[PDB]
Amino acid sequence: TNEAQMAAAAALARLEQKQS
C-alpha cells in the first residue's frame, strides 16, 4: 500500500545509488 511504497522508494534509491 502507498504508505510503505515510501519505504520502497527509499530502498530502491539506496540500491541504485550504490550501483555507482
Added chain:
Amino acid sequence: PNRLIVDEAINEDNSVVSLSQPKMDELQLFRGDTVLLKGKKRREAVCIVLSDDTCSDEKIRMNRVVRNNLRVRLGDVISIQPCPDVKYGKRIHVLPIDDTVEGITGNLFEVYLKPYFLEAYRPIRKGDIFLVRGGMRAVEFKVVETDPSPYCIVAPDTVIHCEGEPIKREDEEESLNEVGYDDIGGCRKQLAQIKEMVELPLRHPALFKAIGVKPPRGILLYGPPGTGKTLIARAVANETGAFFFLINGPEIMSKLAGESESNLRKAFEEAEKNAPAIIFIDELDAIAPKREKTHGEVERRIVSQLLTLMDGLKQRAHVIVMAATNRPNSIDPALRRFGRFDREVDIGIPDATGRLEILQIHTKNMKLADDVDLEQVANETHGHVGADLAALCSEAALQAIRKKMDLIDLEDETIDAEVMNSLAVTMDDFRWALSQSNPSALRETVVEVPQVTWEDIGGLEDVKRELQELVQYPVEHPDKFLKFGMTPSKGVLFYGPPGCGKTLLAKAIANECQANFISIKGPELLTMWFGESEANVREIFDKARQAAPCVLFFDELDSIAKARGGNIGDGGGAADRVINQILTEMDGMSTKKNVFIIGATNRPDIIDPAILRPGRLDQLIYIPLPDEKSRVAILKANLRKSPVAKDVDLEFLAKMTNGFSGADLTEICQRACKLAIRESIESEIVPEIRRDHFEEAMRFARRSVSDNDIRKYEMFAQTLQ
C-alpha cells in the same frame, strides 16, 4: 508453504531481502511490500522485499544483520508472511552496544542514528540489532522501546530517543563485526565451492546420517601467503556455527618429541567433544613435510600421526579438517589420498576485480573523498594480495588521521565521534599508502578473466568470429557437434607478422566467454628451459584444469628456439624439454574440462611441428599486417587515451603506414603524444595533439616488419593453403 532457504545477499542494507519472482507471486506481494521473517527461538524481523535475477526460486537472500537477529544461519529455512498493515511509528528508543562504543564518545545520535533513519523510512523491530558504519568504526544499536509493537517504520516525523549506558551484548547473539563471508573479497567461486562442501554436513547433520552419502572430511587450500586461506577457514566456522580449533605447524614443531604428537591428538579430541567442529591446520607443509625429504625421526613420525588422526575422522562425527599450504606439492602425498584431504581448492591471487572488492571491504567504515578511485588503485596494485591491500587501506586511513584528526585529538583515551565521522581519506593518502606497500606475490602467475574486449582490436573481424566458433560453438550448440560427429578442436596457433594483435585476440575471446585467462609469456617458457625445470609445465596445466572454464595462452612458443640461436643455433631439432611436457599435458587434457589452448608465434618456420598434429593446436590462423581500414581503426583506438585535435587526418597517416604493424601504429600515437607534452611543458618556460605532432612523428617512426619479412610471412601462409 512460505518457507524459504536462507542465502547470502548482494545488497548489504539492513532492511532489504530479495526474492525470485515465482515466490513473490505465490506470496501475493510486490516490490517494496513489507514482510515479516520468522526465525528461531521466537524471534522475528521486518524487511522490505525487493527482486533480482540472481536469487534461486526456493531461496531468500538476506544480509548478516537479518540472519543474526533471526538466530538463523546460511542453509536454514525461515517463514515469510506479508504484513501490509504497517504504518509509521511515533517514538523509538535506540541505544548502542558496548562492544563497539570503544575509543569513542560524543553525540552518537547525530553521528550515526540520524543519518541511518533520515528520509530512509526503515522498518525496525523491538530487540533488533542493526549496524551503522562510519567514522572508521562499525557501531551496532539495539531497539529497546517502541510505542507501537512489535514493529514499525521509522519515519522523518518520529521521535528518536537515546539516553543511557551502552548495552552489553547478549549470549544469544553474535557480534556483527565478527569475521564472516562478507569479509572475503576475491576468489568468490572458490568460497562457493567450499560452501557446497561444508554448509550441509554441518548445518543439517541428520541428513548425512539418514542418507547413504559420505561428507567431505578434508579440504586443502593453497596459494601465496596473504590471500585469505585462514580468513576462509575462520569465516566458514563462524557462519556455520561449528567449533573452531586452530593448529599451526610452527607451534606443533616447537614442542618436544612426544609432546607434539600428544598435542595434535588432543586437538582432534576437542573437535569431537565440541562437534560439529572445524580444524584448521596452517602451514601443512611444515607440520607434515614429505617423509622422503626429511631425516628427522620427529618430522617423519608426525606425518604418521597426522595421517592416523585424519583417518580417525570416520568415527569422529561431524568434524571437518581444513589445511593451508603455500604449494600443493610441498606436502607428503599420503595426505592427498582418498579420504583425508581428498578435496582441494586453489585460492591463488586476487584478480583485478577481486582487488577492488578487497579494497571496498577494508574501507566499509572509511569515509572516502570524492577524488578517491579504488578501481584505479586495484589496477595499479599488480602483485598484491589481500594482506597487502588491507595494509594499504590501513596506511591510507592512518595518514588521514595524522594530517587532520591529530590536530583535534585529546590527551585522553577517546575521540569525539563527530571528529572521526568528518574525517575523509583523500586520493593523496591512498597514493602515499600505495608507494609504501610492496607486493608480496609479484612473481607468481596471476590467472583472471581479462578486460580486453573485441572493440579493443582493430581489424581482423573474421578472425574474431573464428575464435567464437572454436571456443563458444562446441558448448553453445553441442547438439550440432554430436549430430554431425564433429570433434571440437583443442586449440589454435596464431602465426604471422608481429604486432598484429595476437595477444588481444586470445584475451578478447576469454573475456566474452567469461573464462579465466592464463598468460604464459616467453620469459616463463625460457625460465623453465634455461633451468631445466620443465616439471613446472604440469602445474601450469593444472591451473587450466582447476580454473576452467579458461583459455590457456602460450605466448612466444618459439622463444626457446630463438634462445637456441633461432636462424642457426645447434644441430638439434625443434623439440625440447618444455615443449615436450606441454605436448604431453595436452594429450592428457579432455575437451570436457572446457579448456581451450591458444598459441602464438612470429617464427612458425622454427616451431616444433608436433604442436600442429591432431589433438594439439591443429587449427591454424594467419594474422596479416592490418590493411588501410584496420590501421585507421588501430590509430583511433590507441588515441582514446589522449586529447587529439580535429585537424589530425588519421586516414592519411594510415595510407602512408602501409607496411606498419599495429605495434608500430602505437609508437606513432605515443611519439606524437610525447611531442605534444614536451611543447606544452616548454610553453611555460598544447591543449591537444596537433597535426604537426603526428606529421613530425612520421619522420622517426619506422615499420618493424621489413619487406623481406612480409614476403616470407605471406609465402608461408600461401604454402599452408
